[PDB]
Amino acid sequence: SETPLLDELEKGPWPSFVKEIKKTAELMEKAAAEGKDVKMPKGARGLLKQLEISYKDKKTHWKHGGIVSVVGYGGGVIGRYSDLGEQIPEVEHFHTMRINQPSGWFYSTKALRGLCDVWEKWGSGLTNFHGSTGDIIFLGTRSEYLQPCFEDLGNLEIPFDIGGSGSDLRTPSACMGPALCEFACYDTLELCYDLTMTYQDELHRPMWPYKFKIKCAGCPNDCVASKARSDFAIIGTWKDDIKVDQEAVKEYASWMDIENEVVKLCPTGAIKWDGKELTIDNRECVRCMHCINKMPKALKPGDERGATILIGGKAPFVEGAVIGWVAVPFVEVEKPYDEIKEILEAIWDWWDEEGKFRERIGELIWRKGMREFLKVIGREADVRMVKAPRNNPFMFFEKDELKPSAYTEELKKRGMW
């Protein structure tokens, strides 16, 4: 038994990843021995042998990455080296390539086969479907293969570009939205792609103080974890009434416990059912989705559609983990999305000019304050941005809000104020 500890994980009902790695090397070496153009047939085996050592040691065996990229781009390729570099020669360079996924992770078989063709040739044959952000992960290749691999991916009948990494605009992602989901309040997939295309430069050439992520969710169900996993979460919503087919609700009440499983569960008591009629007070509705989730035949989002924008979402690093908060209560989502673009650019100009090294947008707002953030995006403060007004009276007042006085003239006299 070459790999006793890993082999224990080929057992069990769940699809084994150890099986995936083995399946790769064996067939890649089977291909190369058959005269195929495989540059890294040894790739997946060495990876397995190193992981076996890591399981023994209970520690990583990858060291810090000497920076690497492709011509024109600054991001999208992440360098990685093994500290067992000489013992296992084939994992001395095992760089990842991030391949921009199609919005909503939709694929035709050709596209996918094309990716496989190029990666079999230039890489380890190991991929991630899909990466956390959403990118396709080409896992493991050498430095001088990066350049030719990128040439060919672009020359495929169904061509793929590189995703985002480093201090850039990351690859945006979107829920299935209108492609499959009757809840969709806007075309998530179109918005995702349009953005990806519009700011190609900001994605490929990192110029910002840190990373920036965008995720698009069809409705407040947030099927791409946008509020936790992106600086800029564009979440679908509506302004008018939940459209209610009353007979369809009778079809539910024939069997469903609408009083317990719906009425009593609505956060704000907006939804009533007496046996005959269902009544929704849309003034009291917070569009939480539950009732529509419960009775999708019967209930639907309103006609006046758009999105709430949650700013700040990030992992804990530096100042703490953030679920994005309300920045723009309502904005229209209509092509070419000028109102959303205007916002993004204003934020980026400000964040580039003012952001510290490795400071996330949410930390910048925290540092600078919502007043500055709102004037940057050109919007008014709105009670909907907070769960509650401030619990202390330590308010900043703007110069021009003050009554002229002996005192303000004193400040003026000395060049303060």
Binding site: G134, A179, P267, R287, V326
Partner: protein, 363 residues
């Protein structure tokens, strides 16, 4: 000529299944037939069956081609993945639904399931969102792919059925910078260190940009050493986040014996019924035990089986807690409250707790 750049991904609309392309943004309602199979009826009246399967996330290109072989057959050469790294097929002819489910199992060993029906009120466990681990990352405290396999083995039956009263998400992060929706899941496994970094003075001078290493410490444990031209670490102020190692290869804090995972619960992303919530630590540390991580698995199972037992239809783990409180939570789950669970992270501002971290509000 020159190498073409700045062209982006393929246009998604070209990669849509014909029935999906035609009935875009025009659906009537969905219906969960059984676990792993979801039906979608269009306003045109067209009916398509979405069929979901668990994947290891990490895929061989050969296990990719083999999915494409299946795709051409049951589903007109069209395919997709999910936000939780599952794979979904689109079948039109509903007689060939089970054929698909079976062929998939024999060809690649990918279980059907990962779904839930809010209408009836029965839920299945979906895939675990996770990251690289010892497979590719240079700063992990645990390994994602291994623990995921070990957990899902124990909790397989849950993925395959709708045996849960409400939605449960299980997620994983290999270190403190917590990649994925880990800080907002019903159950979270988070790689932590418990040991401060011993500086390598030689490695720092040649490679590390000191001021930004020092600035990246959230507690200020780091002070620049002028002499010397190195970094000093105050052990009393270090909480083993390992951010300094992210910034500087001369700052390892790795200790195979004391690195492990914390378990967190009570996260939530959706708006339904109640607001989004960040995850909360309820087990400070469990050891790395490759390859089965039996202590980790037992504690996740223990927790999930506790909430499963008590929780009302729809009531998620954080919602349960809303009802019973943390007093009764720690009892029923059989976990111990220690001082490690009292938050002491100074840098996060109080005023964030006053911001609206939700899409929920009145017009």
């Amino acid at each position: 000529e020159g190498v073409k750049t700045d062209f982006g991904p393929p246009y998604f609309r070209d990669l849509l299944h014909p029935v999906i392309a035609k009935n875009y943004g025009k659906w009537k309602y969905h219906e969960v037939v059984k676990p792993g199979v979801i039906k979608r009826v269009a306003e045109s009246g067209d009916v398509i069956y979405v069929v979901r399967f668990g994947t290891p996330r990490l895929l061989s290109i050969y296990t990719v081609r083999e999915l494409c072989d299946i795709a051409d057959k049951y589903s007109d050469g069209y395919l997709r993945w999910t936000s939780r790294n599952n794979v979904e097929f689109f079948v039109t002819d509903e007689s060939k639904i089970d054929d698909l489910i079976n062929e998939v199992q024999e060809r690649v060993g990918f279980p059907c399931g990962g779904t839930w029906d809010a209408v009836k009120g029965e839920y299945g466990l979906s895939n675990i969102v996770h990251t690289q681990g010892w497979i590719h990352c240079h700063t992990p405290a645990i390994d994602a792919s291994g623990i995921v396999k070990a957990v899902m083995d124990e909790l397989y039956e849950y993925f395959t059925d709708h045996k849960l009263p409400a939605m449960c998400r299980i997620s994983l992060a290999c270190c403190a910078n917590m990649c994925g929706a880990v800080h907002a899941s019903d159950i979270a496994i988070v790689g932590i260190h418990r040991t401060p970094p011993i500086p390598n003075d030689e490695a720092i001078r040649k490679t590390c940009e000191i001021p930004s290493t020092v600035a990246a410490c959230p507690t200020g444990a780091l002070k620049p050493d002028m002499k010397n031209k190195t970094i000093k670490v105050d052990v009393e102020k270090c909480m083993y986040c390992g951010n300094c190692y992210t910034m500087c290869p001369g700052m390892p804090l790795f200790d195979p014996e004391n690195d492990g995972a914390a378990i967190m619960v009570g996260g939530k992303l959706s708006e339904a019924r109640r607001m989004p919530e960040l995850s909360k630590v309820v087990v400070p540390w469990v050891p790395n035990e490759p390859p089965r991580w039996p202590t980790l698995v037992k504690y996740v199972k223990q927790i999930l089986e506790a909430w499963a037992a008590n929780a009302n239809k729809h009531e998620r783990l954080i919602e349960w807690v809303d009802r019973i409180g943390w007093e009764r939570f720690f009892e029923l789950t059989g976990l111990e409250f220690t001082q490690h669970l009292i938050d002491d992270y100074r840098i996060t501002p109080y005023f964030y707790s006053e911001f609206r971290a939700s899409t929920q509000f009145k017009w």
